[PDB]
Structure 1
Amino acid sequence: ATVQIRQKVPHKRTFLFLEQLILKHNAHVDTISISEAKDGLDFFYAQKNHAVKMIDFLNAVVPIKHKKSEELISQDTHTGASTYKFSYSVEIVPICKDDLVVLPKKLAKSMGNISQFVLCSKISNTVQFMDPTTLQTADLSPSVYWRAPFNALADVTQLVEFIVLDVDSTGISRGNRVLADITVARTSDLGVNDQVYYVRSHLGGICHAGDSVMGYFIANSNYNSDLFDGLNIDYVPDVVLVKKL
């Protein structure tokens, strides 16, 4: 038996996180050995039944999709139990925790009538997206994802330093001090001549003056997704603030 775990992302973030949580509940009790790979790691389970216990652990914490195959070794004649060698192929959804993700049109109008240009907040069993301009959330089960798989537009490496000047709140809040207009300016164009950006963000409560936040700076990127090309360009924000520090 083998639970082949794969994720198609070069920068592993969720793949690091699964190694920490596999040890907390300590699901690795029945591993004969642990091998790794290019884009994941492989496990070895002395009986068939120890592997099905593990997939039911992975179903609760991370979006997966699995299927099985087998092969013959012995072909025993008397009993009939021909001692096959099973294999389980697990694939994770390639969206990371703070990706910039442009939704397709049919999927965006199905859930919440949300705008297509969202972030990600809860990387857990369902993937939760969040519109940073106007706060509204929606969940995406893996059964809805793999029937039409898309990609993430950006990743956690295209983030730029930003320096907050003030926090101008509008007042409406979901649970986390929503829709604060933030006057922000990059670390690069701070000392040189004055260039100021002004944007809404969900980061209203934990944000104060003189602080460093990270965010996507859309105005200088030439993306090449067709979902991004099928938008209305003069509605796209310039900056999407992601996190503090």
Structure 2
Amino acid sequence: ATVQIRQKVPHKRTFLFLEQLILKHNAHVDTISISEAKDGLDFFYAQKNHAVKMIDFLNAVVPIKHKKSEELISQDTHTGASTYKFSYSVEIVPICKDDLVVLPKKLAKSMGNISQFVLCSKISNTVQFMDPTTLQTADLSPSVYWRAPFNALADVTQLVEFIVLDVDSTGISRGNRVLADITVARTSDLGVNDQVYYVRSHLGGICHAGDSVMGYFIANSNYNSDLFDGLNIDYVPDVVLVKKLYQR
């Protein structure tokens, strides 16, 4: 038997987190070989049992969808019981950890009437989203994802960094985070221009005045996705901050 782990994304971020945590959890006890592939890998096993054990391990940390197919090796008669070659297709959700997502309309209305223009916030057995403009959270299971799948709007490689010119912390806080009125300037714009951008970020306490932050920039971007073209363009912000670039 073999399991074929795939993720249809260039930057295999959750895949790299998974191959990091497999050495912590030590799930590679029965691996015959580790073959590479186009965008995932293959684990090979001499029995169906550790294939099911590896899938049961992946289904506790990774949002997956898997099948099982078979090839008849040899039909051995006098018993009627042939032997088998089994192949499992473990496919990860293609939304990584800090990804700008435009959710479907009825899906966004289903999960708590969240805003349609969200970030991803945590990858686990389920996929967690986050509104940046209000501290609002939603959860999407892999089974509900794969009925009508969708891909992220902008990858983590589309991030451009900014300089935090002001933090106004006059927002409403949930746990571990706090809303703000952060005034940022892009560090290809300050030094030549003199203009800024106001955002209601969820990084209202993680970054102070002056430091470098990293986020998406919608105003210069050029998207082609029907979910984004259905959005009201008067309510999509210009900047979405995702993470602080802590220099050390």
Give the TM-score category using the shorter length.
over 0.9
Change (3 A) 1:9 1:182: same
Contact 2:201 2:241 in 1 (8 A): yes
Contact 2:169 2:205 in 1 (8 A): no
Contact 2:171 2:181 in 1 (8 A): no
Structure 1 residue 80, shift from structure 2 partner: 2.8
Structure 1 residue 138, shift from structure 2 partner: 0.4
> For structure 1, which segment, 162-171 or 76-85, has the greater mean C-alpha deviation from structure 2 after superposition?
76-85
Alpha-carbon RMSD across the aligned residues, in angstroms, is 0.9
Structure 1 residue 79, shift from structure 2 partner: 2.7
Q: Secondary structure at the match of 2:174?
A: coil
Question: Identity percentage over the alignment?
Answer: 100
Change (3 A) 1:81 1:152: same
Contact 1:176 1:204 in 2 (8 A): no
Structure 1 residue 177, shift from structure 2 partner: 3.8
> For structure 1, which segment, 131-140 or 75-84, has the greater mean C-alpha deviation from structure 2 after superposition?
75-84
- Structure 1 residues 74-93: aligned runs within 5 Å: 74-93=74-93
What CA distance in whole angstroms lies between the structure 1 residues aligned with 2:155 and 2:73? 44
Structure 1 residue 169, shift from structure 2 partner: 1.0
Verify: 1:134 aligned to 2:134, yes or no. Answer: yes
Structure 1: where are the runs of 5+ without partners? none
Structure 1 residue 78, shift from structure 2 partner: 2.0
Structure 1 residue 157, shift from structure 2 partner: 0.5
TM-score, length basis structure 1: 0.98
Change (3 A) 1:8 1:177: closer
Runs of 4+ in 1 over 3 A off after TM superposition: none
What CA distance in whole angstroms lies between the structure 2 residues aligned with 1:179 and 1:71? 55
- Structure 1 residues 46-61: aligned runs within 5 Å: 46-61=46-61
Deviations along 1:148-203, one digit per CA (max 9) or x if unpaired, are 00110001001111000121011410013422100100111111120111111000
What is the aligned residue count? Answer: 245
Q: Secondary structure at the match of 2:199?
A: strand
> For structure 1, which segment, 170-179 or 50-59, has the greater mean C-alpha deviation from structure 2 after superposition?
170-179
Q: Which residue of 1 aligns with 2:146?
A: 146
Q: Which residue of 2 aligns with 1:43?
A: 43
Deviations along 1:204-224, one digit per CA (max 9) or x if unpaired, are 111101100000000111100
Contact 1:75 1:83 in 2 (8 A): yes
Change (3 A) 1:82 1:149: same
Contact 1:171 1:177 in 2 (8 A): no
What CA distance in whole angstroms lies between the structure 1 residues aligned with 2:177 and 2:28? 41
Q: Which residue of 1 aligns with 2:20?
A: 20
Deviations along 1:64-90, one digit per CA (max 9) or x if unpaired, are 011111111111112333111111111
